[PDB]
Design a protein around this ligand. Structure first.
Ligand SMILES: Nc1ncnc2c1ncn2[C@@H]1O[C@H](COP(=O)(O)OP(=O)(O)OC[C@H]2O[C@@H]([n+]3cccc(C(=O)O)c3)[C@H](O)[C@@H]2O)[C@@H](O)[C@H]1O
Ligand SMILES: *CC(=O)CC[C@H](N)C(=O)O
Ligand SMILES: *CC(=O)CC[C@H](N)C(=O)O
Ligand SMILES: *CC(=O)CC[C@H](N)C(=O)O
Lengths: 657, 339, 340
């Protein structure tokens, strides 16, 4: 029923940070630039346009700010901006020196559809080094009440909130340059109070190192406040009597850079981006210490004044001004991925090391199939042993054939290798149980499969008892998610699971990383390389199910939200980025029908079927910021629930193709 | 004047330590802590910050609620306190402690034979892999005092520790998640006059989490014109569900001063000389810092100030600081090119 | 003049504590059960129907409470039950996890005749032993103002009172499970402020002796507060991953049990009872120290928001859902009489 292709309908809000052409001392001209940039924002369906500090006057005009004609010109340019915004869709936030009581205030006028919503004075006026703001301007910290603008008294002060009434996840707070540089920023309290989108208007003359400073503090604010941060600085046109301007603009969301514009531009620039208000909602919803902090400053936070406006955003397809990656567990940026891998690996190793220290260095029993997972776990187990000064021959690896890679790796590593043929025991069990296969019937059902799976595990566990060892778990996060494993006796069961927290899509990249580090050597490298090259299509592509895993595990997003995201990430193979190690051939695209089909399978398997196998999970380290699936940790759920509501949301909300 | 004395030039030698945790065994944690504090003492350091719940192990879950665990924590604490009589640095050591109805996630500040104060963690994460509110009480809003082996020492989140013989050294302590909330305890402490912010962390390691620690510890220090001293738990913490990297780091006004190896084998210390005069000078010049204090006057004037005397070394103990030859010309090539 | 045979005209108010069938993670199914039980309360001429904690979602679902589709479905089911209450007599009190500001709260939604009257957050969230509530849910104590439920700002908080303008002896306070277990329960203060009927929605997984703990505290609450105490625990349908559920319901009045239902029922159960509002009026009129305690906690008892609604209860003969002893001075129970 929703327009599935509408970003507004998926909880996005389009925000724009703008740097305009300053004509200092000339508000009619600054207004005219602002208006032209506002119309481009409207055209883009943006709900917010933040301009630089003192937009209407020029930031750098010094005592020209005290000139009657300057002040008067400003006021008339504003009233004209307001009249024009009648037919503009975005909330406009626009700097202006304004008269109130005894002084001029460095203010931000929040404008929307033909009416001022509020005027926000700069709380904090730098009067040091190259800044002289206390000379011409009065602090706004702790002023309240109203201000008369064009025949209307409108909220004036630093405790204002602009809550969109048709967009409950968009609640705007405004501050101004130095406001965000002090230990206790205005916007920190406003996030506790309920602001989701934090605007900052800057003049910010540019200096060596200062752009890093802007970034450090706008980014960490967005992270610590679980907010978007929208930041605009002055550029061309400001006075160069003592200073220069770079016109930097940027948008942050929860510590991530959504957009940024060119530094030192010829001409005006914008950062436009889609902010995910559900990501912010979900993060707040889960970090209760955020609410604990609000209740600690209840007086501060409850004092805020909330101004409403109907945003009435466009209903149609307007694209997604957002970078949605194909692999939420696998960053496309190669130095970021190198970092994840370093960390994944060391997490797995140190987790297991502690298990081994704690048990006075047991032997290490591991089933090696030549697959990616067991291959990787062997490597992890080898490094653990090295670091602890234990002989590699204390790793007891077992090939367990049922009805080359493993053996080569085992020998290259120098671990104790052995083959145990489970065939005769499988045969005897299938007969004892009266399975049709024991009388010739080619019935290859779950029992047939499980009898083997189970016996592998049964054997390893008995070896472990007999030989003073522990069985290493091999199953990865994606398997835990789907219940693609054999419960209890089999697969799912071990003394310690190193891959438990690692999703399937990340596994190959870990091996790549192991080869690259080169620490094991030429032959080991070669065998590992070989394992990658030699190496379930009814649970779907793991690339799709890991995409779904991240949205549910981190954010709890509804299914139609996940389809939207996956479709945007995976729809066109030629668009967006791929991590290292995907040859052009190895680069699939997925249709909406494909994405929808496998998501139906995900919700059913994840929410309903698989919890019970997750519920009795061996020990192992959590790996990913995306979460892990331990029932003692990240994922607490019933083993006895239907996924009806998720499947119903897909029927109603996600188009069939 | 001793020209070659870092202390006489307004420096304070600060240390962030990651010890070897023996979970559920306080006496052994105190042994690892005491060993590392003597190393710090030898280095002429004035502060040693250890990880969250140092004396118990952070990761022991309901073992925290076991009586023998708490008795042993207290006996170990009292012995640590006894041993510092001879130790130059102020020790900041985590412990689960009984006060009133519950146990608190505390940092105990220890100097020269006495406890100076006890600081409860303010915000207790109870989400994802964190379960802290199950065993432990929030420290936010708590004041008054606490009985530690025959003395009533200050207890609460509003404490400053000032070196009467070294005024640029003013210490505030917060614990792990305390630095991740919109309005950290430590932001208010800086306005009240804290120049050195300690953070004891447990902080199970996850992909990306060091970047997060970094961002908030660096941005804290820059926003608050302070040194920020961070110490996380490492080897020995339970790996039932989690992994530990024992990261320690020292920031100053946005700059990184020192940091230690991640996932070390064995104990590690970051040690660095903090320029209290740097901090002093930035504070002096940035008036809007003090404007912010005055806006939160009642918040910032209520802090309690505990005095101690450091009596630091008079002599030449080198300088644990990278002083660039060209303040105007970064030696780092990437940075120089950016400049 | 008066219809002599009308319990309402004699200052009685009919109340139901209900235990419904849970379908964990399925609010439309929970709502259909609720609506059906509410229709039976209406047919009984009940003024009030209390359902178990988190009625709409299921109490036992843990992190599923944090799912957008869980919360959205909860909201939609809730709106339909409010639309369906247009034709129902009783105030319904149904549990639901609802978003407010940063988090979800464990709430009771007080519903009457096509509108929501108020939304009461659980005050104290057990985070110990088998309970994990602070992980998913925010505490409700100290929270005021309002919440937007389907295009309407309705009172929100632990300071709320639902007073019948046409039945002045019926003044309702709602609290949730653990709220009655703490040294200073929210219902205690609400009694001093005027509440005469105290509702408790519970999840309360069952354990050896726990029904005895519920009784101890519901009973003594009703006696110490000179009030009716209406209590519903969760039942069949709830997750048995780690817990079991007994579906216990009970109605107390000044220390005396009015009604209680079968434990571990197969199917839905109710306690329905006529509460004597004049009996409560009478005990309060006479025990001045009750009012002395109110004036001692004057600031605390005077800030409750009173929310009015008209009941229009039935005027005719609907019998009397109450034990009336032939000999008030001679208890018909042998063990009780022997003691007397
Ligand atoms: N909620 C619940 N609570 C308690 N018990 C529950 C239950 N739901 C099912 N069960 C029981 O558990 C059993 C079903 O679970 P399980 O024994 O795992 O059996 P099941 O999950 O039905 O099948 C396992 C399948 O996963 C695939 N697999 C397994 C292992 C390795 C690989 C590989 O590619 O390497 C693939 C393979 O296709 C295999 O047949 C049944 O006995 C069922 O009655
Ligand atoms: C506009 C502004 O306040 C920038 C000055 C700030 N303190 C800085 O960049 O250091
Ligand atoms: C404690 C700390 O500084 C980092 C880890 C923290 N618990 C988190 O990232 O949530
Ligand atoms: C009503 C409830 O939250 C369970 C009972 C309570 N936790 C208790 O203390 O028994």
């Amino acid at each position: 029923s929703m327009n599935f292709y509408s970003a507004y309908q998926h909880g996005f809000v389009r925000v724009a940070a703008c740097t305009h052409h300053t004509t200092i001392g000339d508000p009619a001209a600054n207004a005219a630039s602002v208006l032209d940039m506002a119309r481009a924002c409207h055209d883009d369906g943006a709900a917010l346009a933040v301009f630089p500090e003192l937009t209407l006057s020029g930031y750098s005009i010094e005592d020209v700010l005290l000139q009657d004609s300057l002040l008067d010109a400003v006021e008339d340019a504003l009233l004209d901006l307001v009249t024009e915004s009648a037919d503009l869709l975005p909330v406009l936030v626009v700097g202006a020196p304004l008269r109130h009581r005894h002084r001029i205030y460095n203010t931000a006028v929040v404008i929307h559809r033909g009416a001022v919503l509020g005027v926000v004075p700069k709380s904090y006026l730098p009067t040091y080094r190259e800044f002289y703001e206390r000379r011409q301007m009065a602090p706004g910290d702790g002023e309240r009440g109203t201000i008369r603008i064009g025949g209307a008294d409108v909220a004036f002060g630093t405790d204002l909130l602009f809550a969109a009434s048709d967009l409950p996840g968009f609640v705007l707070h405004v501050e101004i340059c130095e406001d965000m540089f002090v230990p206790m920023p205005p916007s920190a309290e406003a996030a506790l109070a309920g602001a989701t989108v934090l605007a900052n208007l800057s003049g910010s003359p540019i200096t060596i190192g200062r752009a890093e400073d802007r970034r450090l503090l706008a980014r960490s604010a967005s992270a610590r406040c679980l907010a978007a941060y929208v930041y605009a600085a002055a550029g061309e046109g400001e006075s160069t009597t003592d200073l220069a301007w770079d016109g930097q603009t940027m948008i942050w969301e929860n510590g991530a850079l959504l957009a940024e514009s060119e530094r030192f531009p010829k001409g005006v620039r914008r950062s436009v981006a889609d902010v995910d208000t559900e990501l912010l909602r979900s993060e707040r919803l889960r970090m209760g210490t955020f609410d604990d902090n609000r209740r600690h400053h209840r007086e501060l936070t409850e004092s805020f004044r909330r101004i409403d406006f109907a945003l009435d955003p466009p209903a149609g397809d307007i694209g997604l001004l957002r970078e949605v990656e194909r692999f939420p567990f696998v960053p496309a940026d190669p130095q970021r991925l190198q970092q994840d891998c370093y960390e994944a690996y060391n997490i797995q190793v140190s987790g297991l090391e502690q298990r081994l220290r704690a048990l006075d260095y047991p032997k290490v029993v591991i089933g090696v199939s030549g697959g990616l997972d067991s291959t990787h776990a062997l490597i992890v187990a080898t490094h653990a042993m090295d670091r602890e000064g234990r002989p590699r021959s204390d790793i007891l690896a077992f090939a367990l054939p049922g009805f080359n890679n493993a053996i080569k790796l085992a020998r290259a590593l120098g671990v104790t290798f052995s083959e145990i043929d489970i065939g005769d025991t499988a045969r005897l069990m299938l007969h004892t149980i009266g399975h049709p296969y024991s009388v010739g019937e080619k019935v290859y059902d779950v029992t047939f499969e499980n009898v083997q799976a189970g016996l592998r595990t049964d054997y390893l566990f008995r070896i472990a008892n007999q030989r003073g060892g522990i069985v290493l778990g091999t199953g990865d996060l994606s398997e835990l998610a789907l219940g693609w494993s054999t419960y209890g006796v089999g697969d799912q069961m071990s003394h310690y699971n190193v891959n438990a927290g690692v999703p399937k899509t990340l596994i190959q990249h870990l091996i790549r990383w192991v080869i690259s580090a080169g620490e094991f050597g030429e032959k080991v490298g070669e065998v590992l390389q070989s394992v990658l090259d030699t190496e379930e299509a009814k649970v779907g592509p793991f690339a799709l199910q890991d995409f779904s895993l991240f949205q549910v595990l981190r954010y709890g997003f509804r299914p139609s939200k996940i389809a939207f995201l996956a479709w945007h990430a995976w729809n066109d193979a030629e668009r967006g980025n791929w991590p290292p190690g995907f040859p052009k051939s190895e680069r699939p695209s997925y249709s909406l029908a494909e994405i929808r089909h496998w998501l139906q399978i995900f919700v059913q398997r994840f929410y309903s079927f698989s919890q019970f196998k997750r519920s009795a999970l061996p020990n192992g380290p959590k790996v990913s910021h995306g979460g892990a699936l331990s029932p003692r940790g990240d994922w607490r759920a019933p083993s006895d629930m239907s996924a009806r509501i998720w499947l119903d949301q897909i029927d109603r909300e996600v188009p069939k193709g």
